[PDB]
Design an enzyme around this catalytic site. Structure first.
Site, mmCIF file in Angstrom:
data_model
loop_
_atom_site.group_PDB
_atom_site.id
_atom_site.type_symbol
_atom_site.label_atom_id
_atom_site.label_comp_id
_atom_site.label_asym_id
_atom_site.label_seq_id
_atom_site.Cartn_x
_atom_site.Cartn_y
_atom_site.Cartn_z
ATOM 1 N N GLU A 11 -1.070 -9.299 -24.868
ATOM 2 C CA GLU A 11 -1.723 -8.471 -25.870
ATOM 3 C C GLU A 11 -1.399 -8.874 -27.301
ATOM 4 O OE1 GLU A 11 -3.960 -6.244 -25.198
ATOM 5 O OE2 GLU A 11 -3.693 -6.125 -23.020
ATOM 6 N N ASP A 20 -10.385 -5.312 -30.442
ATOM 7 C CA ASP A 20 -10.045 -6.000 -29.198
ATOM 8 C C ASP A 20 -11.167 -6.953 -28.781
ATOM 9 O OD1 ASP A 20 -11.970 -4.448 -27.822
ATOM 10 O OD2 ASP A 20 -10.503 -3.358 -26.642
#
Ligand SMILES: [Cl-]
EC number: 3.2.1.17
Length: 162
Positions: A11, A20
């Site tokens: 991440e 994202d």
């Protein structure tokens, strides 16, 4: 290696609101804020999550605290889900990390829909599960991360992350 290090690799860490891979407002170590296109809505979610007026920016301590909460929420979602819990409990510790990783990325409901992959994992048919897991929007949209997670299910090792 452990689940926190694995997801931190997958991440990254960003202290200001970002988007994202699906275009959704996110912060920290992959903490989804909202699917709304409104940055103000994302900022409100952030303030609610942190407990202060953040203006779209957090500290590293805050990012790590959110991350710990998010990992725990993924684990508890697995354990409360009648489709995911039996597969999870059948796995060794390294493969359990791969399962948490998927739930962290796609949510409890999303992973619970991988019915045939879950069956193959519970049967310990690792190569067959790996092939089946790759036949997914998940693999096609995030192939490098999916390949790491799938390799973890296939081998039961941390080799993809080393
Ligand atoms: Cl990727």
């Amino acid at each position: 290696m452990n689940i926190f290090e694995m997801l931190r690799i997958d991440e990254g860490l960003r202290l200001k609101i970002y988007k994202d891979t699906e275009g959704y407002y996110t912060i920290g170590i992959g903490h989804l804020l909202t699917k709304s296109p409104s940055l103000n809505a994302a900022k409100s979610e952030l303030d609610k999550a942190i407990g202060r007026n953040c203006n779209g920016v957090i500290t590293k301590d805050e990012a790590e605290k959110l991350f710990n909460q998010d990992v725990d929420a993924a684990v508890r979602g697995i354990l409360r889900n009648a489709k995911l819990k039996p597969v999870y409990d059948s796995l060794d510790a390294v493969r359990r990390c791969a399962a948490i990783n998927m739930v962290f990325q796609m949510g409890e409901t999303g992973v619970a829909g991988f019915t045939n992959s879950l069956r193959m994992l519970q049967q310990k048919r690792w190569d067959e599960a790996a092939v089946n897991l790759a036949k997914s929007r998940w693999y096609n949209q995030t192939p490098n991360r999916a390949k790491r997670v799938i390799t973890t299910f296939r081998t039961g090792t941390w080799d993809a992350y080393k």
